[PDB]
Amino acid sequence: MTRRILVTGSSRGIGKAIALQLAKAGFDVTVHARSRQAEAEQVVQEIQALGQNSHYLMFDVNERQTVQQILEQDVEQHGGFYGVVLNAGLTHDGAFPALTDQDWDEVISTSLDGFYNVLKPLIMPMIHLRKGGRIVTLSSVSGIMGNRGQVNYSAAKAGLIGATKALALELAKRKITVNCVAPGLIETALKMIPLQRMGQVDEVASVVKFLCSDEASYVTRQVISVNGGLI
Amino acid sequence: MTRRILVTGSSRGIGKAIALQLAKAGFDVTVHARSRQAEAEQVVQEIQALGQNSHYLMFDVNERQTVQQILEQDVEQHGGFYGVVLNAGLTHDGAFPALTDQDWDEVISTSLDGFYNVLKPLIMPMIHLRKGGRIVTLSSVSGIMGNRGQVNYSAAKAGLIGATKALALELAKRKITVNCVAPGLIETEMVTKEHALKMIPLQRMGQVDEVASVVKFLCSDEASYVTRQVISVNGGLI
Amino acid sequence: TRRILVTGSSRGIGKAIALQLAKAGFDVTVHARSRQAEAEQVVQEIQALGQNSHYLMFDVNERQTVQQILEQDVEQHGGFYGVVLNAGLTHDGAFPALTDQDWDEVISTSLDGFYNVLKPLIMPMIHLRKGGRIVTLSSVSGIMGNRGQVNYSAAKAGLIGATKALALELAKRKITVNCVAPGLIETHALKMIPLQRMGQVDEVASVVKFLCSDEASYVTRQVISVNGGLI
Amino acid sequence: TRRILVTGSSRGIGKAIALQLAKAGFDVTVHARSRQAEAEQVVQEIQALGQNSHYLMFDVNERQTVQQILEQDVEQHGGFYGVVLNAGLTHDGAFPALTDQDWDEVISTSLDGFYNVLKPLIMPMIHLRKGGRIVTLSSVSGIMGNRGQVNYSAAKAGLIGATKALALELAKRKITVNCVAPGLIETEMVTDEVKEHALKMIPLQRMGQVDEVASVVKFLCSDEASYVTRQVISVNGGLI
């Protein structure tokens, strides 16, 4: 059976570019979105047109019990996921003393609760494939160095890095690599970027696609920055 | 007058060592504990015996509304804090598939909601002192490199680093430095050790005062050009 | 056709890089210090893969000889679109026991190698007016240091600094400059590697090949570790 | 009393380090490449603070001279408990425009300086049987690179790798080995282009003072910093 990869937030933007590149690489790809159902179906159709199998799942990554039920049912129907790309996240920018409770909690939970809620039901189905696996998280340059107006987002994306590195250590014995891709400023003050432009969605997706390939078998526990030389 | 520093989790261990070194350096130091009131009052009397003023505050850093009321009342009675040391944290170790919801949620929130719940009521009072300031968070080598059985704690302590660096950028123009201290294996962490000592180049656990000395240095006036940093105190582990 | 110089490509990691870049569609120029027959065999393999190839022989420490050979090669065959700098050797020993030669050979082969090879090639690369690729090979010991390798750790760390600075100078010409830092590669720390095995040469070469590809256009100034999760 | 060598200590950051260490109670040996009268001024200030001091003259690149002077000094005054390596120069320029001298003198002064100064002093330090302190001075350019400084970035990054490796070799001797990486500091002979670019990026919006760097070195040389080793500590106003 063909190896299948889940990409969260894959109805548009970076997530969609990742989904399409993984399909072109020969993976079956399961699309996900929180609410844009018609958009998710368009991506499913494009993946099918590439010759792979696809369908979409709808959930808010913060809804722990609903995510568990949807993923357990999907694994029962279609087998375990060989790969998981955790792409969905959220910003609520503002100066730290001006941040509301919602600005803080929604940003923290979407990245960190999302990591737990999506990956917890899928670790054992991945191990049961007995063929290794791939987990890639999407952080941010702000998770590496911090950013004004983004104490919450910098915390959420930095926490993702720590979770990724720790999980890489736990799953290494099962040949599951676990890595993080940290984009800079992407199209979806450029005076600080050495390449002097925003990045394109495919320039991020190509890195995720490489890490998901069999060729990247000795890369794990890493944060790979795709940021045009910003840091 | 005398600059005052809040140290969370200072009734014992590393937090206590930090509070006593900061008192010896000439700060007034406010002690904090979640629930061990008698322990906290003992540290208060030690700080008084070291020549500084002290009292304790009791709260769970996760209780957002309670923390705000307690800190806002304390600032009204005693003035803004010049410094805040965020030392209190929590572990719930276990392999990622073994972790319970509570194991995950309590570890993430204690560090990350603790940061928001304690610092949000205190940032503007600190700025209004108009004399700079100091914020030091306590992370962990696990936040830098990850650790087996600690996916939750690694995420919490790495998240603290991101928050620290971003806050450093916002507060630099007020001459408030914001830094992180990341201890390795310290004598107050209960372990069963022989493998860990083989990984540490110095081949021994750190002592509480070896961590507190770094925090004390960052809080000093001499550390005025150090901000946005993670300083590891780990015997060479990484 | 874009042409890439790979130093030290008659065997080992350098050979695997040369062959992967040939399979990707680049013309590849092979290099060796002295093993001429070995270099010719790699050239013949690149030709059998359908690309043009020849070899160049030089000690990377012979500054003037390197300049003459490379300037003549660029006049005969055009500027290099890419350069993979794979230059270094170890002379392990306790620091106070290292000889002058142990220190100077290790420092110079990596850092004078960088200067001696790249200085004559930067302007011919820019004059192609089509971007470019530079990849240097460092080591995990350049990132974190290693007992018995104060000299090698210094040389490898120095390559990382030179790479990051050169990335800043060349970004405006759309030349990316990156570093690949291998861990323990097959060419007893195994209880220390999470994947519990040495890397294979193609697991390093795959990362170099990805960085040289058009897809990697927003990645620059980076050190990418291929070390099985060692750090 | 414990004795510390500080190289390049006749002026600037090195002088600030030497005076802060003397105030902390170390005997301090001053070093300079060529300015003998400048060095003697610092010696006299350290003596006035109540510690023992003298100066040593050498180019850190002249390997055999460094070895003879240092081994003679250790025979006369005992081993050094601490060494602060403050060694390096810049020769800025676009990489294709760097001359052989621009490259070689920048690489060698930092990396050859590390080997030339420290190799004769490691065993005398170990033979004290009371631990020790080694601190190297790198730069933010060694951590992230800088335009016009491919040579300096390489030299200062190399210093970091050497420091971390030596920390591992000496950890069981209770000798800590660390690196301090200043950002843009007053008195630093830097180009206007490097200086203007740095100011816009520094969150504190100012250059550092020499004592803001020396205080970090002094802390690492103190007995309290005994569990800090293998580290690079940035003193850069938040630049990175």
Numbering used by the authors:
A (entry chain D): 1 to 188, 199 to 241
B (entry chain B): 1 to 192, 196 to 241
C (entry chain C): 2 to 188, 198 to 241
D (entry chain A): 2 to 241
What do the authors say?
In contrast, bacteria utilise the FASII system which involves a series of discrete and functionally specific enzymes that produce fatty acids primarily destined for incorporation into membrane lipids. FabG (3-oxoacyl-ACP or β-ketoacyl-ACP reductase) converts β-ketoacyl-ACP to β-hydroxyacyl-ACP in the presence of NADH or NADPH. FabG enzymes belong to the vast superfamily of SDRs that play a broad number of biological roles in eukaryotes, prokaryotes, and archaea, typically sharing 15–30% sequence identity and ‘fingerprint’ motifs. We provide high quality crystal structures for three enzymes: a functional low molecular weight FabG, a putative FabG protein, AbSDR, and a HMwFabG.
